[PDB]
Amino acid sequence: IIGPVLGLVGSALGGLLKKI
Numbered sequence: 001i002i003g004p005v006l007g008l009v010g011s012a013l014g015g016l017l018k019k020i
Contacts, residue, residue: 001007
């Protein structure tokens with residue numbers, strides 16, 4: 001991927017959303 005950052009944050013973004 002052009003930027004693994006956007007991909008990694010997006011992952012933690014769904015994990016934080018789980019209990020959000």
